[PDB]
Design an enzyme around this catalytic site. Structure first.
Site, PDB file in Angstrom:
ATOM      1  N   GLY B 128       0.771  -1.230   0.000  1.00  0.00           N
ATOM      2  CA  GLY B 128       0.000   0.000   0.000  1.00  0.00           C
ATOM      3  C   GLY B 128       0.808   1.290   0.000  1.00  0.00           C
ATOM      4  O   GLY B 128       0.247   2.372  -0.214  1.00  0.00           O
ATOM      5  N   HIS B 135       7.171   7.777   4.672  1.00  0.00           N
ATOM      6  CA  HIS B 135       5.995   8.450   5.184  1.00  0.00           C
ATOM      7  C   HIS B 135       5.024   7.507   5.881  1.00  0.00           C
ATOM      8  O   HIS B 135       5.165   6.288   5.830  1.00  0.00           O
ATOM      9  CB  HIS B 135       5.258   9.145   4.041  1.00  0.00           C
ATOM     10  CG  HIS B 135       4.488   8.207   3.166  1.00  0.00           C
ATOM     11  ND1 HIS B 135       5.097   7.304   2.322  1.00  0.00           N
ATOM     12  CD2 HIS B 135       3.154   8.014   3.027  1.00  0.00           C
ATOM     13  CE1 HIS B 135       4.171   6.595   1.700  1.00  0.00           C
ATOM     14  NE2 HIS B 135       2.985   7.006   2.110  1.00  0.00           N
ATOM     15  N   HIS B 204      -0.545   0.416  31.890  1.00  0.00           N
ATOM     16  CA  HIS B 204      -1.875   0.336  31.315  1.00  0.00           C
ATOM     17  C   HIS B 204      -2.381   1.702  30.854  1.00  0.00           C
ATOM     18  O   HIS B 204      -2.948   2.465  31.638  1.00  0.00           O
ATOM     19  CB  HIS B 204      -2.855  -0.246  32.332  1.00  0.00           C
ATOM     20  CG  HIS B 204      -4.288  -0.177  31.899  1.00  0.00           C
ATOM     21  ND1 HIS B 204      -4.880  -1.144  31.115  1.00  0.00           N
ATOM     22  CD2 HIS B 204      -5.242   0.759  32.125  1.00  0.00           C
ATOM     23  CE1 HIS B 204      -6.135  -0.807  30.877  1.00  0.00           C
ATOM     24  NE2 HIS B 204      -6.379   0.345  31.478  1.00  0.00           N
ATOM     25  N   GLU B 275     -10.451 -16.821   3.688  1.00  0.00           N
ATOM     26  CA  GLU B 275     -10.326 -15.614   4.490  1.00  0.00           C
ATOM     27  C   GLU B 275     -11.456 -14.621   4.286  1.00  0.00           C
ATOM     28  O   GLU B 275     -12.119 -14.216   5.236  1.00  0.00           O
ATOM     29  CB  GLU B 275      -8.989 -14.929   4.202  1.00  0.00           C
ATOM     30  CG  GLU B 275      -7.762 -15.706   4.681  1.00  0.00           C
ATOM     31  CD  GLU B 275      -7.303 -16.790   3.710  1.00  0.00           C
ATOM     32  OE1 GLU B 275      -6.303 -17.472   4.019  1.00  0.00           O
ATOM     33  OE2 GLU B 275      -7.929 -16.959   2.639  1.00  0.00           O
TER      34      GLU B 275
END
Ligand SMILES: [Zn+2]
Ligand SMILES: [Zn+2]
Ligand SMILES: [Zn+2]
Ligand SMILES: [Zn+2]
Lengths: 301, 299
Positions: B128, B135, B204, B275
């Site tokens: 992608g 970037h 956390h 999938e």
């Protein structure tokens, strides 16, 4: 640019406005494959299709039992003896042989109460998850109702609770029809996930695939044949994935009103990135409104 | 090993397991779309900068079964030099990238029309990656995404059982690779992708933009102790990384079991019918094997 949602997927998609990019399964070498479960016609040396095991399955049928042993049924369906013929070439009656065959292997698995879900699918093209070129399909019994199913149950239900209607039952008033047969009608999903995605939904509200008969399997065959053909051309013979969606085996009576199976074809036109992975949300570079037109135009002269 | 399904609260779903063996200037260097800010501020001798995305997935100008395309689609130009990679950049410059995100989350938050922000990075067109110049990107959304909602389900239903945050229970519910001052990296028990890697804050925290300068450098380092191992061991594969944080308006109630983290996924295989039809994945390598090969790797 907008977000469209559908009961079936139960998720939003982003629309933001395309082309592609012998053998151990051949007759005779039928002794190089995993244990045979059956063939069509019944054990006839002049076969048209057959289902075999899987040497290295994703789930083992030899383990029937935070974690769950990998028990399942990973089977393969050889769609033909001829290495040059694909699912797009087979005669509509032949596809019917395939569809009635899926039904067969699916009806046998249902006897095993340990099978929660069964995913039947087709991969044409290496990049789309298909090693061999020989026409083949698969089946992976699952001891767990998968996410797309859980989502679908919830989606259509919620919809049904607020509308009393079965989203996929009002297909003509929901999606974009590419073609229509006796008992089926293909469409471009109003909220389609992938570019040029197509759904072929049965016309009768049935909660499961293994309810179809021979007459309908041949009718659905042609509509599936016509859709793969218009795909193969208009999109420059791109690779595609084929998968069948349906309610689990233990689907409840209560779920039956809004549960209706459908057929989905996804041509591999583009990959994903970090946005999709991290969110589950996706982007479609081709509206379904523009798929319906182009699809109803493509020819086969 | 033999097939073995696994499920984690975070993904809130099962994964299949059935198995060293795996293989493999521009108009942005110091013409771009409107800038939001850079670093240093208004400084011409800039290291990084965030700009509008010339062709946004969600148009910020739309601001108003179907919803309007409102949303913010921004880009983070990670370097002045065309030939640089996050993995290389010193733990300092990356921190500025992380801080830039935090800084960006802050501004976006002011908008109530937004409900979830997705920060991520692509490297190698095959994953992608838009261009070759280093970037990352931030996608603002008017809706919380399935994974966050899914995760909200699993982190809760699991909390309403053990009274604990599975991610605070990282060290014990996963396969530790490497640990830094404020973060740790593991091989998720039910990881979705082969060689998938998680970097979790040891404290956390429920939202990424809550991280401070010290943690940003400690994290910048671990995110730098893992990637260099990925590029080596797998031999520079494409990859995607995406931080997973709580919704803009997460409820106090969900707070005890909402722990953010960064997901790094090395591209080693594509998907298929199964999938897309189920939403369940097939992973060729147990996190055990992955956890045992990532510790050995020496940089
Ligand atoms: Zn063959
Ligand atoms: Zn129906
Ligand atoms: Zn450049
Ligand atoms: Zn925690």
């Amino acid at each position: 640019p907008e977000l469209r949602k559908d009961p079936v997927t139960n998720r939003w998609v982003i629309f933001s406005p395309f082309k592609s990019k012998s053998c151990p399964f051949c007759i005779g070498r039928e002794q190089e494959c995993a244990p045979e479960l059956f063939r069509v016609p019944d054990h006839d040396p002049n076969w048209k299709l057959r289902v075999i095991e899987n040497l290295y399955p994703a789930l083992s049928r030899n383990l029937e039992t935070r974690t769950i042993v990998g028990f399942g049924f990973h089977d393969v369906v050889i769609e033909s003896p001829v290495h040059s013929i694909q699912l797009s070439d087979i005669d509509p009656v032949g596809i019917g042989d395939i569809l009635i065959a899926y039904k067969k292997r699916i009806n046998q698995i249902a006897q095993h109460d340990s099978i929660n879900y069964i995913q039947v699918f087709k991969n044409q093209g290496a990049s789309a998850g298909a090693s061999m070129s020989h026409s083949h399909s698969q089946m992976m019994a699952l001891p767990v109702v998968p996410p797309t199913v859980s989502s679908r149950l919830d989606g259509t239900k919620d919809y049904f609770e607020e509308t009393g209607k079965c989203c996929l039952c009002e297909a003509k008033s929901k999606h974009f029809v590419i073609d229509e047969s006796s008992h089926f009608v293909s469409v471009a999903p109003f909220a389609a996930t992938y570019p040029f995605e197509i759904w072929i939904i049965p016309k009768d509200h049935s909660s499961h695939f293994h309810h179809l008969d021979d007459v309908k399997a041949v009718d659905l065959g042609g509509l599936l044949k016509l859709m793969l053909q218009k795909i193969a051309k208009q999109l420059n013979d791109p690779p595609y994935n084929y998968m069948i969606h349906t309610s689990p085996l233990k689907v409840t009576e209560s779920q039956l009103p809004y549960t209706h199976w459908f057929l989905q074809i996804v041509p591999q036109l583009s990959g994903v990135g970090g946005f999709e992975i991290g969110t589950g949300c996706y982007i479609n570079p081709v509206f379904p409104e523009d798929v319906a037109k182009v699809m109803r135009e493509v020819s086969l002269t």
